[PDB]
Amino acid sequence: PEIVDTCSLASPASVCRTKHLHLRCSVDFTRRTLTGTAALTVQSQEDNLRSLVLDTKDLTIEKVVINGQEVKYALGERQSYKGSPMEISLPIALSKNQEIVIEISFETSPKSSALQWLTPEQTSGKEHPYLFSQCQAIHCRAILPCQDTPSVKLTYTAEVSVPKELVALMSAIRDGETPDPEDPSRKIYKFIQKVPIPCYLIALVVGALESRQIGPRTLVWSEKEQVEKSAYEFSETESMLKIAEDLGGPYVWGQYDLLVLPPSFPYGGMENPCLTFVTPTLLAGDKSLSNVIAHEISHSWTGNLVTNKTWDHFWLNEGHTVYLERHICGRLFGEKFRHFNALGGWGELQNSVKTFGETHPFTKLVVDLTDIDPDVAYSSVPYEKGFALLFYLEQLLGGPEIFLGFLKAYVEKFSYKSITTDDWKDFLYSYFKDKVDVLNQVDWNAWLYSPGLPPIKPNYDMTLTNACIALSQRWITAKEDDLNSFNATDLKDLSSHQLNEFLAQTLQRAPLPLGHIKRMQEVYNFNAINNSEIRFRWLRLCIQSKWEDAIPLALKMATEQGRMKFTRPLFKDLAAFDKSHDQAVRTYQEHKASMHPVTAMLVGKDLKVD
Ligand SMILES: N[C@@H](CCC(=O)Nc1ccc(OC[C@@H](O)c2ccccc2)cc1)C(=O)O
Ligand SMILES: [Yb+3]
Ligand SMILES: [Yb+3]
Ligand SMILES: [Yb+3]
Ligand SMILES: [Zn+2]
Questions:
Q1: Is 46 in the same domain as 185?
Q2: Which terminus of the chain has fewer CB atoms gathered within 10 Å of its CB, N or C?
Q3: Pocket around ligand 1 at a 6 A CB cut-off
């Protein structure tokens, strides 16, 4: 038995394992480069090892040093999105289990697909620049040479130099600050990560950062003007950490800090160990998007502790994480709320399947990513098909109490390791050996490997959903003589989550007649709502229903923030509406140079330009 990562060009885990990284680097805002040395401790897994291969993407290599001597190296030609393979020739041949430190002096490209450089005018303070990393899935190679695969896990110590008036933070514990020994006006921040992580969890941020304390092991980081709203928005963090510890075992990372990025941050969150990255679009002003925090918190076990071996098995990361997320929200707000969110996720699943097509290879639970850019295939499917499976099994195996017992053991058995769907399923059968017959009733083939909607829908409690269906249906079937009965009172007992679910449900039946959508704004005033989730679905409904007045609103939102879940479909909807098409394409061309590289490439492909 042997399994290879088809997203990596580096030497595989069965040949050699990276065990440690010493990073010393300089952050240069003038050149937009990351400069420095990456010292890799490498353990050989076979006898007679003469050379290894590492991943790179648009990297400049200065020199390769092994034991104080320069050695031979060769970069192969670029294989599109995978980058360029780097063969390093070792001077002394390695036996099984032997270690060598390989020091690579590197410079990053200004166009690194891992990083976004912000000018002062692109930030909030407007006086200092900004940089952030997003390595997931395979962008770490665009920062440093590494085995860019989640099948390898490594500790790391880092030392990064930044201008005196800026703060560096990494996916590690802060080791304190001391001025550069060979310095301009600079500060050299030190970091240590004692826990072995996959390299996609390596992260760096540099900007005019200030912090506020909101929990015993939690600090919110952001620019001065965001720190206030953030401290309030995420107050529930420690209480979420506590419930997550009860569900998955002890939290091993020591510290759980949050960082609120610039609006161009491409995701809801990123579970960078010790330092969760979140979008500023979470700042609703009422804590209502805090499920995203629960999500990143849950990754401290499912994802960061037990890690997908290859990206083919991404669903292990996200399925279990969404499962724990919804349990945190459930234990906080009630079991009925947990069902409401679970049904809404099925809803999102339905949408991804309709969008891709019910026979699309990207709707499979386990996808073959041979010659597929992980960024193109990314969707809600692994999240929600993954949640549905676990949810279904939970109901099948006798409830959440029993299944959370499996979950805890699963985290315990596979902690600090990298696993496949098969390891998971094999452990499932091992744990529930008293229930093998029940497990053989499940259509494993269809769930794991079939496209489309799952072969079976779980059971959902409907308490909080009914009012959403009632109202959505009323609008969807509305005629002229219903329009005057619609009223602000329709919304009186609805939470922001229910409002969102109402719009999601109505969006599935778009377009609605223009007159009806105009009447919707007349009676509900959905334009005045700043909740990003609500605004997003609302503006999509408007654009898809041919409302011209919504064009500048959707244009504003699509470019005033970068979160791909909002930005991409807004651009797509605006391209599909003939009134806005030209303007959508023009707006993207003006904004693309100052957008995030991954977001730019994706929106560009969405729009069929370049
Ligand atoms: N982890 C964060 C979001 C950023 C992220 O997951 N990045 C990312 C990007 C591309 C990926 O690609 C693999 C993906 O294309 C895929 C799709 C379907 C099935 C398996 C894998 C995986 C993760 C979070 O959950 O809050
Ligand atoms: Yb150089
Ligand atoms: Yb340079
Ligand atoms: Yb009627
Ligand atoms: Zn996740």
A1: yes
A2: N
A3: 136-137, 267-271, 295-296, 311, 314-315, 318, 362, 367, 374-375, 377-378, 381-382
